[PDB]
């Protein structure tokens, strides 16, 4: 499986925050937003990842994450010339994806909760169909929305409905088989002139292979779209971290716990950052 992080968009709502800094490099407590969705692809066992951003911000993610091999993964970069919607990721990434299955995660999505990584791996290792993730939210009409039935099987899937048929939001994390690129090629802009992931999910629904994993109320799903939610997501992270002295979405911890790196490689990483807390945190970990 390959991974794609959609990490672009013009950053309107966060102005002036986003005047000279890209949205997904802004802090969520103690590390760049982008670390959060990257962590998720890593835990799913995806080792080969395309990061998409704007022409002016794409180089700045590349300056931060490099080419991935310090995390013992592989990272690549592509420019989205402008934000024509999320399905466009599969067009822009057609060539990085090629022959394989692909998972898409939104660059401004924070996921967290016990057992989450078991769910991610089932999905990441499924070799056909789509997997999407649902979550009971306050104002479901703000999001894609999935209604399902009895057995947990999907009866519909609609983008931002004036009258939502369900509380379960479709979240910014998606797993697909190889058919998705030719799917995204063959549908067209909506009323807001974007290529909609909902219509990508609608297609899989017709093929009879759209799976939902529904996330219960023990998971957290936040997105970092506004000054209010950004700060909220921030408080929520530091509360988890202050308490347990474990970090959320520390990339190097995940590379190592996941096998992508060795103790000795983790130690080479810790070593130059020993002047700061994040480095001592990595070093503590190698000591076990
Ligand atoms: O072409 C694009 C479009 C969006 N983005 C970014 O991707 C994120 C998603 O866009 P946004 O406008 O914030 O959300 P919506 O487009 O309204 O909704 C999408 O993302 C939601 C995630 O909350 C889902 O619930 C919806 O079903 C899905 O349509 C944002 O961070 C954008 O900056 C890009 O980088 N390029
Ligand atoms: C093991 C591990 C889990 N997680 C996250 C995934 C889940 O959302 C939550 C519980 O595993 O913690 C990390 O962020 N980093 C880690 O190193």
Q: What do these coordinates show?
A:
Strands 1, 2, 3, 4, 6, 7, 8, 9 and 10 form a nine-stranded mixed β-sheet that branches. It is built from eleven helices and eleven strands. The longest helix has 18 residues. Helix 10 runs antiparallel to helix 11. The protein is of the alpha/beta class and 288 residues long. The chain is globular, with a radius of gyration of 19 Å. The chain has a single domain, classed as Alpha-Beta Complex (Spore Coat Polysaccharide Biosynthesis Protein SpsA, Chain A), CATH 3.90.550. Thymidine binds next to helix 1, strand 5, helix 5 and helix 9. Uridine-5'-diphosphate-glucose binds next to strand 9 and helix 7. The PDB classes it as transferase. Keywords: thymidylyltransferase, nucleotide binding, transferase. The assembly is monomeric. Crystal structure of glucose 1-phosphate thymidylyltransferase from Aneurinibacillus thermoaerophilus complexed with UDP-glucose and thymidine. The protein is Glucose-1-phosphate thymidylyltransferase.
């Amino acid at each position: 499986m390959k991974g794609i992080i959609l990490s672009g968009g013009s950053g309107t709502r966060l102005y002036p925050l986003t005047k000279v800094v890209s949205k997904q490099l802004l802090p969520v407590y103690d590390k760049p937003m982008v670390y959060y969705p990257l962590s998720v692809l890593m835990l799913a066992g995806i080792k080969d990842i395309l990061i998409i951003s704007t022409p002016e911000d794409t180089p700045r993610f590349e300056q931060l994450l490099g080419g991935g091999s310090e995390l013992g993964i592989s990272l690549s970069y592509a420019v989205q010339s402008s934000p024509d919607g999320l399905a466009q990721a599969f067009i822009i990434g057609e060539e990085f994806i090629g022959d394989d299955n692909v998972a898409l995660v939104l660059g401004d999505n924070i996921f967290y909760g016990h057992g989450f990584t078991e769910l991610l791996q089932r999905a990441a290792n499924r070799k056909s169909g789509a997997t999407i993730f649902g979550y009971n939210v306050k104002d479901p009409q703000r999001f894609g929305v999935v209604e399902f039935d009895e057995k947990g099987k999907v009866i519909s899937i609609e983008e931002k409905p004036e009258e939502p048929k369900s509380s379960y939001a479709v979240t910014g994390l998606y797993f697909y088989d190889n058919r998705v690129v030719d799917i995204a090629k063959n549908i067209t802009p909506s009323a807001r002139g974007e290529l909609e992931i909902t219509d990508v999910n609608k297609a899989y629904l017709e093929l009879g292979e759209l799976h939902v994993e529904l996330l219960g109320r023990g998971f957290a799903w936040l997105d970092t779209g506004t000054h209010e939610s950004l700060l909220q997501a921030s408080q929520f992270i530091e509360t988890i971290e202050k308490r347990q002295s474990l970090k959320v979405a520390c990339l190097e911890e995940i590379a190592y716990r996941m096998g992508y790196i060795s103790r000795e490689q983790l130690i080479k990483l810790a070593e130059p950052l020993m002047k700061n807390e994040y480095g001592q945190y990595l070093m503590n970990l190698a000591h076990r």
